[PDB]
């Protein structure tokens, strides 16, 4: 029927506390890591390197990279990033896990901050892959190894083969990893809520995940702007039943949502403790 009593953060929180809401899926994008100093390269002034390119997405297009990996690589030296430490949103997703609410987190992001926030591979679908690993492109390497190669401004080449080595990312025009489809196809039969945070839903098939959700399943967007509207979402029409849109920074929305669940305090302590810990290892 209509599981939200109110199309609001207040309504969602209230729903999250009911016994009906057990399995939560988070769909997240570049918008949940920018406060961690990771610039959303899809919604860029950010590029400014020639390296003459027909358009930014070209450097991430797989054909182009294989012939001209340089634009991609000069970038990735430009965003270090100095050191990685995850956001309130990230740590929100951790509390979900800890509280037995996190069915799965599907990320478009390649920073691996979900992991550093305490989320284990079981909990996680790295839809577009990781930097952690890298392979010889020749279908016949660790972070540094590679990290060093990137900061030396020389392109990654295979020890054995001398062919290009790319990080284990899904480039555009590459197929997404298996796990993604097997996971989507049963997660989305079980899901009670959808948190969509920090994403514009301009990448496929990732963004088509919001339409796998059951008709009854409410969906909350925490994004700077509205997105995925039409199966598509419906926040404002008179027909609207299941969808809620909170506009602002991700970190702010997660603190708000957390306040209504009575977790703000725990979350803030958690971010603090974990960031202090990270510094220690320096």
């Amino acid at each position: 029927e209509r599981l939200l009593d109110e199309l609001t953060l207040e309504g969602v929180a209230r729903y999250m506390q009911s016994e009906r809401c057990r399995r939560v899926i988070c769909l997240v994008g570049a918008g949940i890591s920018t406060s961690a100093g990771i610039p959303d390269f899809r919604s860029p002034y950010d590029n400014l390197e020639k390296y003459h390119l027909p358009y930014p997405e070209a450097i991430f297009e797989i054909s182009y990279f294989k012939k001209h990996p340089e634009p991609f690589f000069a970038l990735a030296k430009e965003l270090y990033p100095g050191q990685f430490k995850p956001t309130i949103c990230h740590y929100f997703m951790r509390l979900l896990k800890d509280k037995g609410l996190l069915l799965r987190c599907y990320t478009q992001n390649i920073d691996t901050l979900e992991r550093i926030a305490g989320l284990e591979q079981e909990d996680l679908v790295e839809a577009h892959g990781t930097f952690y690993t890298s392979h010889c492109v020749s279908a016949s390497y660790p972070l540094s190894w590679m990290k060093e190669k990137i900061f030396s401004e020389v392109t990654p080449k295979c020890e054995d083969c001398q062919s290009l080595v790319k990080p284990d990312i899904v480039f555009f025009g590459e197929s997404l990893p298996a796990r993604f489809f097997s996971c989507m196809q049963s997660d989305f039969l079980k899901v009670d809520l959808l948190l969509v945070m920090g994403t514009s839903l301009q990448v496929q098939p990732f963004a088509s995940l919001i339409s796998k959700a059951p008709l009854s399943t409410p969906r909350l967007l925490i994004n700077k702007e509205k997105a995925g509207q039409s199966g598509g979402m419906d926040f404002d029409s008179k027909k609207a039943y299941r969808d809620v849109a909170w506009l602002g920074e991700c970190d702010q929305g997660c603190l708000a949502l957390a306040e209504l669940l009575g977790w703000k305090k725990e979350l803030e302590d958690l971010v603090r403790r974990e960031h202090a810990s990270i510094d220690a290892q320096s």
């Binding site: 899809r42 997405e57 577009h128 899904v170 480039f171 555009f172 025009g173 590459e174 197929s175 997404l176 489809f181 301009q202 990448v203 496929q204 098939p205 990732f206």
Partner: peptide
């Protein structure tokens, strides 16, 4: 095309 990353 199939099911692999593709922008807008």
């Amino acid at each position: 095309g199939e099911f692999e990353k593709k922008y807008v």
